[PDB]
Amino acid sequence: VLCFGQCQYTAEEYQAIQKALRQRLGPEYISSRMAGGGQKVCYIEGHRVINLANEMFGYNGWAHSITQQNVDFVDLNNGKFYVGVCAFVRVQLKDGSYHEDVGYGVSEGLKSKALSLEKARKEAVTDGLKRALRSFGNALGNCILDKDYLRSLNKLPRQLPLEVDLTKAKRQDLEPSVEEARYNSC
Amino acid sequence: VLCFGQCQYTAEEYQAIQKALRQRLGPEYISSRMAGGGQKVCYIEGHRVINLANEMFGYNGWAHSITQQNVDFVDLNNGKFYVGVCAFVRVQLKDGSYHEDVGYGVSEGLKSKALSLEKARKEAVTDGLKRALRSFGNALGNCILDKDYLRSLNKLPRQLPLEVDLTKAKRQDLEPSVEEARYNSCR
Amino acid sequence: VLCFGQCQYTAEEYQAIQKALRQRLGPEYISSRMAGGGQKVCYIEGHRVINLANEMFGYNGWAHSITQQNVDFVDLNNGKFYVGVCAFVRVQLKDGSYHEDVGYGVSEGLKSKALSLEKARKEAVTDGLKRALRSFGNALGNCILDKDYLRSLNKLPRQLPLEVDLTKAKRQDLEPSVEEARYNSC
Amino acid sequence: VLCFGQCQYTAEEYQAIQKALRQRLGPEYISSRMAGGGQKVCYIEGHRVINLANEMFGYNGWAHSITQQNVDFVDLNNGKFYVGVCAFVRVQLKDGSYHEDVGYGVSEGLKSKALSLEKARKEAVTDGLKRALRSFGNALGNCILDKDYLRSLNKLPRQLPLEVDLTKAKRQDLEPSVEEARYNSCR
Amino acid sequence: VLCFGQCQYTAEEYQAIQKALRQRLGPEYISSRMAGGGQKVCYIEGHRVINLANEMFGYNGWAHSITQQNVDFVDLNNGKFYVGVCAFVRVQLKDGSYHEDVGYGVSEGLKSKALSLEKARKEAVTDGLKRALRSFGNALGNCILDKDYLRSLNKLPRQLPLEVDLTKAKRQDLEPSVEEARYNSC
Amino acid sequence: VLCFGQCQYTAEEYQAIQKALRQRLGPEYISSRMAGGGQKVCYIEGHRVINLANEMFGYNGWAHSITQQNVDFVDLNNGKFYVGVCAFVRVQLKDGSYHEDVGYGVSEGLKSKALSLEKARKEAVTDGLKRALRSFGNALGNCILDKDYLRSLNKLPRQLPLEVDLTKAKRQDLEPSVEEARYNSC
Amino acid sequence: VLCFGQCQYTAEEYQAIQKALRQRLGPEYISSRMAGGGQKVCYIEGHRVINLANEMFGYNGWAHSITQQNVDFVDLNNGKFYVGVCAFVRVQLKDGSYHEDVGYGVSEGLKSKALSLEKARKEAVTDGLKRALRSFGNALGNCILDKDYLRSLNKLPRQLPLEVDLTKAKRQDLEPSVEEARYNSC
Amino acid sequence: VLCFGQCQYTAEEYQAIQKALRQRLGPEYISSRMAGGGQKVCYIEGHRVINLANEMFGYNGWAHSITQQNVDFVDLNNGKFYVGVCAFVRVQLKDGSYHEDVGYGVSEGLKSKALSLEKARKEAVTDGLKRALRSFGNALGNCILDKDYLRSLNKLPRQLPLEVDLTKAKRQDLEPSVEEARYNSCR
Amino acid sequence: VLCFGQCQYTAEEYQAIQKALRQRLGPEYISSRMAGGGQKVCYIEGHRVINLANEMFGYNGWAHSITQQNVDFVDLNNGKFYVGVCAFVRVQLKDGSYHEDVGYGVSEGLKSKALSLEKARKEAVTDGLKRALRSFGNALGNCILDKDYLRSLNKLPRQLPLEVDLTKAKRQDLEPSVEEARYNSC
Amino acid sequence: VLCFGQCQYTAEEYQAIQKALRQRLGPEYISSRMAGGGQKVCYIEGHRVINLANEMFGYNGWAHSITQQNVDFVDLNNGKFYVGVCAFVRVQLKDGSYHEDVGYGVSEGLKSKALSLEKARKEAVTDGLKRALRSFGNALGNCILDKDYLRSLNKLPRQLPLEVDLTKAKRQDLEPSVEEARYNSCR
């Protein structure tokens, strides 16, 4: 039996994933936050990257663990807390190949110590996940590091906000097709 | 024999779960807290996520462990306790794929140190479980982070509270069909 | 089944990769920083090296982990922080051969402690990845160290900035061919 | 299947590598520093040794790891930093034979502490790699320890600087032959 | 498959190596250094021992590792540094037999602390390698401990310095026969 | 495949080694030093014991490792150093039988700390090797502890120092028969 | 293949060793020290016990290791050193049965610290070996604890000192019969 | 191959050893010390127990190791040393069954520290071995704990000291039959 | 082969031991000691429990180890020592089932520290063994905790002391039937 | 071979044990001790639970180990010692299923430190064993926690103390049937 970490890719799946990972992301994926200095910084939201990984590899095709999370510092100044957190996140595919990266979470200027630590820890883990996933290819966020793609992104017309249709939204816990397939699997 | 962690998904089960994990959750699953600042924050209750995981994967299909729980601080101010707890929670499927996330629990403003620590530790574990389960797809709470989804949710008519029918509620310990199936499995 | 770390190269794949790793990189891959002293320093951007590794070995052909990251020092002087971080990065191929190198990240002159630590840690990890990948051959950046190659680059005519065509950019999460191949694999 | 560390050499490969390792290096490989004392010290640049190892053994034929790196000292004097770093580097062939050596990196007279530490750590790792590779034979740098070889090198006429032709340079990521071979190997 | 450490010697290889290891070394291998007290001390240079080990066992026939290296002391006196370093070196053959010895490196009278430490550490490792290799037989330097052999060496006529012919020297990285054999191996 | 530590002796090899280990050593092996008190002490030089082990077991027949080396003390008195070093040496045969002994190295009265430590460490390792080898039989030095054997040695006529013939000394690295057998082994 | 520790005794070898171990030792094996108090204490010299073990079990039939050696104390009084050392020695047979015992080494009244430590450590190891070997039977020294045996030894007439004939002493390293058996073993 | 610890007893050997272990020891095995209080204390000498274990199980049939030895205290009073040592001794049979006991060694009233420690350590190991061997049955010294057995011994007539005949004593190292059997077993 | 801890019980042996363990012990096994308070306390002597375990399971049928022994306290008061020792004792059967219990040893009012520690340690080990054996059933001492059983025991007449017949006592080491069975086993 | 921890239950044994574990215990098993506050507290003696476990699973059917024992505190007040001890006890069945519980032992008001520690440690281990065994079902003491069962127990008529017949008591060490079966099994 082939469990996770021991399942070799077939030729077809390898070829499809290898071609799909080279795609660059459209403007629908790129958000912009204002960092220090008044310059526009582009990023991809964490849940978008999660959806991209779940489509590229499947829900059972990728895994990630936290190898280590370290609070670098918690400092108090004028009643406000400054917190730095680093996290090392390892992403593994079902064939066993893996990438590890460091993510950093920052909380500055909050009165609550617990809120600052919560924000910085969660941000470090998510940042580590995104940076580790970038190593697989452009479609998982590597392209966002290229200055030419960022320039080409700005010349595109600004698209309207997406509308989510909640007609086919899950409304009950039961998944009958899932239940039938699982029962037949036994 | 295929124990937990070594059971590869069949094609049909993989396809059904992959399609199911992709759909978003209705307003029946979304609750709203009031965080600091007067803004409405949407969330999914822990027991709802537990039911969603138990339906999506089966009761024997998923597992979770507490890799580590750390008290960040317990502070006393004006007789009130402020407690911060972080938990690292690892969720594993029966095929061996896993996700780990950090959860945080906070207790601020209680007189009892024991009650504060209890609340913060339990909240950290539950929050870690929810964040780890979000990594599998939209149907397990990954949609709660999309701004467009929340905007579309706020425009839906406010559905009335659900009514639970307790006529078909379990009233005695014995489960006859379970016993028959288990006895048949014993050889 | 051949999982990652146990997959021996075939003759054809070995020969093609051995020839490809041997060639040098064009000016399209070389950027230039300005280190202290006013002299021009050539380097390759991290995302470019990631793309080169993903094309040379495939997305499942190489892996990298962080063996250890150590903050050498965090110092405060005149309200500015000076941070030194070292990282040991191990790159492994799917056949099991590996290289490990040390990368260093430096942050000097920032007011924020958290920003300095974040920059230095991420720089150390990326620098370690680049130095570890250089050990496989010229095409992964080993050529950036040859002075004759740098002279030949400087004698080449300067090329116009690349234009990125975002027509065939990914705009939806779903990857139909990937899903088809994965479903058939099960 | 034969993974790295368990792949025994064939007779032909053993004979070819055993004869090739015995060669001494031409003047095209030797550079010279000016160490303290006004004497000329010959060495081989790190990237040249990397190319030599990748040709002698193949890209998948050799590996190296950092067993340990230790900062011996960081000292401050007159605003200048003096840094000593040692590194232990283990080189392994695909058949499992290995050599380990100690490399040393030195940074003296820099104002920046971070720059000094960076330089010393990188030099210690590179020095360890070169010294560990010397143990396989002359063609990987052992010959540079022989005084007679250095005299013979000094008596050779000086050669012109090499010219690198960048016409046949890699200009795009894709490697079609590599992709074809990999796809054929997959299934 | 027989990897390193579990490859038994054949009868012929055993007999040839057993006879070769019993030979004593000619004057071409012996160097002399002046030690304290005004007496001549004979030794074998490290690279000569490396060549002897590579010919006796092959390049893939022997291995050595550093089990432990310890700085005994670093002392400062009159601005000069005195450094003592010990190293434990284990040499293993491809059949699994091994010898371990301690090597010592000494640096006395240098102004530089880094130079003293570098010299002493490298000397300790090389000395340990030579002492561990002596345990296999006379041809690897065990003969240099016998005083009768040293008397015979002294009574031998002095030979002229060797001349190295660099006509046949490697001038380019590529090894064609090596590449052919490796490609056929896959 | 029978690697080191898993190679059972055949009946013939066992019988020959068991008979050879039982015999005592001639005066050609016994040196004499002068210890404190003016009494003559008999010993076997380390390189002789190494040659004896290599002939008795073969070059691949025995192994030794340093289990632990401990500096008992380094003391300074009147500018002179006194160093005590203990070493635990384990000798193993190719069939897996082993003996471990403690060896001691002493350096008293030297002005150099580094030289004293070097001498004591090397002597502890060599002493441990000799004491561990004595446990196999008389021919490896166990006889030198018997008073009757020493009395018999003292009554033998003193022989002239041995002469070493350097005609058949190794003068080049190459070992053609070794190379031939090794190439055929592959 | 049956390596050391995995080699079951045959019936014949078991019976012969079981009968031989039951013998008591003659006066040729018993020496006498003069312990404090003027009473005569009987003991067997270490090399005799080593020879007895090598004949009872063969050279490859028994093994001993030092599980732990601990210096209990090193004390200085009136310029003289008093050293106590304990060693735990484990003796194993080739079938895997083992005995462990503690041996003690004592050095009292020496000016040299190094000499005292050397003597005490070596005596502790030898004493542990003898006590561990006693556990196999009378012929390995268990008889020397019986008062009746000591009385019978005392009543025995004194025997002349043994004479050692050095006619058939080993004179050269080479063992021709060993070499050919080893060569045929490969 | 059945090595030590993996060698199950046959039925015949089990029955013989089970019957033999049940026997009580005669007066020839019992010695008496004078403990504090002026009362007679019976004991079996260590070498007698060694011989009994070697006969009951064979030389290759039992093993013992020292799991741990701890010096409880070394005290100095009036120039005399008082030493307490405990040892944990584990005895194993060739089938794998084991017993562990604690032995205690005491040295009181000696001027020498080294002699006191030596005596206490050796006594602790021997006492632990005897107590661990008692757990297998009466014939290995368990019977010496029964008051009725000691009462019966005291009523037995005193026996003359044993005479050891040294006519059959080993006089030289070589064991020809042992060498023959070992050589035949070698292949 | 079935090692200890891997030997499954047959049906007949299981049934016989299961019925035998259920018996209560007669007055011949019960001793009485006076504890504090002047009340009679019933107990079974350690050697009796050892005999019961050796008959119930065989000499090779049960095993016990000391998992941990801890001195709780050694206190001095009025020149008298008070020692508390706890021991954790694990009893295992040849099929692998096990019970662990804590035993306590107490020494109060002795002037000797060594005697107090000896008594307390030995009592802790013995008490742990008895408590661990009780959990297998009544015949191994579980009955001695039942008040009704003690009431029934008190009503039995005080039987006369047992008389030991030393006619068939072991008088020499040899066990010829054991020897022949063992020899045939090889 | 099926050692302890690897022996799967058959269908018949599973069904019988599952039915037996569901029974509640009669008043013959329930003792009452007076705790602080004057209320009556019901419990089961440790030896009774040991007998119940040995009948339900067999002597070779269950095992228990002490995972950890920790002295929480030893305090001295007015010459009296107050000792708190916790023990973690793990019970395993021969199929490998296990339960672990914490047991607590308390000794308050004794003058001897040794007696207090002995009492508290032994009580902690016994209490842990009882609580761990309760997890298998009512017949092993899980019923002692139900208020309705205790009310029903209180209404039952008080039964006379049991009488133990010592006619068929064990009087000699030998077990002839056990020896016969063991000898037959030996080969």
Residue numbers in the entry:
A (entry chain H), C (entry chain G), E (entry chain E), F (entry chain D), G (entry chain C), I (entry chain A): 23 to 208
B (entry chain I), D (entry chain F), H (entry chain B), J (entry chain K): 23 to 209
Provide passages from the article that reported this PDB entry.
Here, we report the 2.2 Å resolution cryo-EM reconstruction of the full-length RAD52 (FL-RAD52) protein. Despite our extensive data analysis, no minor 2D or 3D classes corresponding to alternative ring organizations were detected. The c11 symmetry was therefore applied, allowing to obtain an electron density map of the FL-RAD52 at 2.2 Å average resolution (0.143 FSC correlation criterion) higher than without imposing any symmetry (2.4 Å and 2.7 Å). As observed in other structures of RAD52 N-terminal, our model comprises a mushroom-like closed ring composed of a stem region formed by the β-β-β-α fold of each monomer (residues 79–156), and by a domed cap region at both the N- and C-terminal of the stem region, that ends with a flat top. Most amino acid side chains between serine (Ser) 25 and cysteine (Cys) 208 were well resolved and clearly recognizable. Interestingly, densities at the N- (residues 1–22) and C-terminus (residues 209–430) were largely absent. Densities corresponding to 498 water molecules, equivalent to about 45 water molecules per protomer, were identified in our cryo-EM map. These water molecules are connected to the protein ring by hydrogen bonds and coordinate to FL-RAD52 single or multiple polar residues and to the polypeptide backbone, also forming connected chains. In summary, this analysis allowed the identification of a water molecules network that stabilizes not only each protomer unit, but also the protomer-protomer interactions, i.e., the overall N-terminal ring structure. In addition, in our 3D structure, several water molecules were also observed at the inner DNA binding site of FL-RAD52. In this region, several key residues, known to electrostatically interact with the phosphate backbone of the ssDNA, namely lysine (Lys) 152, arginine (Arg) 153 and (Arg) 156 are involved in water-mediated hydrogen bonds. The position of Arg55 in our model is clearly not compatible with the binding of the ssDNA to the inner DNA binding site, suggesting that this residue may also work as an entry/exit gate for ssDNA in the first phases of FL-RAD52-ssDNA interaction, not only during homology search.
Human RAD52 (RAD52) is a DNA-binding protein involved in many DNA repair mechanisms and genomic stability maintenance. Full-length RAD52 (FL-RAD52) is a protein of 418 amino acids, but it is not stable in its monomeric form. FL-RAD52 physiological form is promoted by the association of the N-terminal portions (212 amino acids each) of multiple FL-RAD52 molecules arranged in a ring-shaped structure on which DNA wraps around. The C-terminal domains of the associated monomeric units, whose structural organization has been elusive to date, contain two binding sites for DNA repair protein RAD51 homolog 1 (RAD51) and replication protein A (RPA).
